[PDB]
Amino acid sequence: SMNPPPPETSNPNKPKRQTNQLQYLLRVVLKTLWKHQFAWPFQQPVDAVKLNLPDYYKIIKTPMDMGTIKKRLENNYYWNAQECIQDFNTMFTNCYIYNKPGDDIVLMAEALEKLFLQKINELPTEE
Ligand SMILES: CCN(CC)S(=O)(=O)c1ccc(OC)c(NC(=O)c2[nH]c(C)c3c2CCCCC3=O)c1
Ligand SMILES: [Ca+2]
Structure with a gap:
């Protein structure tokens, strides 16, 4: 079986904004996890074809990964910080x-999630 298409990272119909919280999520939260020694299994979608895991996308119907989150932030896909936090939580839950x-x-994942929760507990004040 094939991989699904990866999650969308741009939507030409969605409004866009920069906020201090989104800057923090990209430049502090995602960056910290991206550079962590354990980041590599989470830097891209699970490739169930190359890894021969044909049950992965039978079990996981809401895939998410930090590469998608990174691109979403870089493309201003998220309007609310909570959208981004939700995607990190989906990635760990999966x-x-x-x-x-x-x-x-x-x-x-437990190590990265501990670090994630530490960094999001310092999320800056909303505008
Ligand atoms: C395709 C080649 N590369 C990728 C660019 S690779 O970096 O050489 C590489 C090599 C082996 C690998 O696993 C054995 C993974 N696996 C993973 O990325 C990975 N990530 C998650 C979240 C999972 C898995 C598979 C294990 C269980 C399911 C799961 O939850 C990567
Ligand atoms: Ca389990």
């Missing part, structure tokens, strides 16, 4: 749905 305690990928 990992815990598909995988089991003790899996390496779960240890990696």
